[PDB]
């Protein structure tokens, strides 16, 4: 998974 705005 990939993304920004949150520390998963």
């Amino acid at each position, epitope marked *: *998974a*990939v*993304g*920004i*705005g*949150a*520390v*998963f």
Partner: antibody
Framework: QVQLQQSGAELAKPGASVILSCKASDYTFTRYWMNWVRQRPGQGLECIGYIDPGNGYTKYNQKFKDKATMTADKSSSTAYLQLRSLTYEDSAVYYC?????????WGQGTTLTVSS | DIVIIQDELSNPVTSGESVSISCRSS???????????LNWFLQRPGQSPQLLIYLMSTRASGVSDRFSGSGSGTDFTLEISRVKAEDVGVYYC?????????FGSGTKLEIKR
């Protein structure tokens, strides 16, 4: 546009389970994290957990730990939230949220009522 | 868990003026990558929350330029430079630096006419 389509409202009895659905269209379902949050009537927002749609890996808020189970079916591009052992306190609106930017796109509102 | 708290607006705001909505966290939201993990939402009655700002200062696609976000590692402010009637609703902050991501209780905005 990125779309999340939600299950219709359900009425369930104390002790039963229910499965809500979140269906992804117009974006690659495997790419982005999927978040599940709850909003009880008149109250604020509360994070239930989140799931990676590519491997089924999950992280839960411990308040909802044994009560909830998040699953993902890649063939149908649909995420599922199972709520077990329902109580009157679980009557709430349930949202799904995903996107490259976390909590960017929502859709949602499956009103769940537990009242016998 | 991280606890997040918001202030309230005293009375209906005047159209055209600036409005500040503030939020404080029980712990620093500055992560080791140098970004601050804080979201601002606007929720209207009967609708899902609409993301306004992420990473504490970056405006979401399509959000009016009247909205700006700023803050330190524990104190954050949402700015509405020229408030309009379309801005009424409930504003939420959220931290995303450590699970579980927690929200504040919301801050209601009403406008005078």
């Amino acid at each position: 546009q990125v779309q999340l389509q939600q299950s219709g409202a359900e009425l369930a009895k104390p002790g039963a389970s229910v499965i809500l659905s979140c269906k992804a269209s117009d974006y690659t379902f495997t790419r982005y994290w999927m978040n599940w949050v709850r909003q009880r009537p008149g109250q604020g927002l509360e994070c239930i957990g989140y799931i990676d749609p590519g491997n089924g890996y999950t992280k839960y808020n411990q308040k909802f730990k044994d009560k909830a189970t998040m699953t993902a079916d890649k063939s149908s591009s649909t995420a599922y939230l199972q709520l077990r052992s329902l109580t009157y306190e679980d009557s709430a609106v349930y949202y799904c949220a995903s996107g490259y930017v976390a909590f960017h796109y929502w859709g949602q509102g499956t009103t769940l009522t537990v009242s016998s | 868990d991280i606890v997040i708290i918001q202030d309230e607006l005293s009375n209906p705001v005047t159209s055209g003026e600036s409005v500040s909505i503030s939020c404080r966290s029980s712990q620093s939201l500055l992560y080791k990558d140098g970004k601050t993990y804080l979201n601002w939402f606007l929720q209207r009655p009967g609708q899902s929350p609409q993301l306004l700002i992420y990473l504490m200062s970056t405006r979401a696609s399509g959000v009016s330029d009247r909205f700006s976000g700023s803050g330190s590692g524990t104190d954050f402010t949402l700015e509405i430079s020229r408030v309009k009637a379309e801005d009424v609703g409930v504003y939420y902050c959220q931290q995303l630096v450590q699970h579980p991501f927690t929200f504040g209780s919301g801050t209601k905005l009403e406008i005078k006419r």
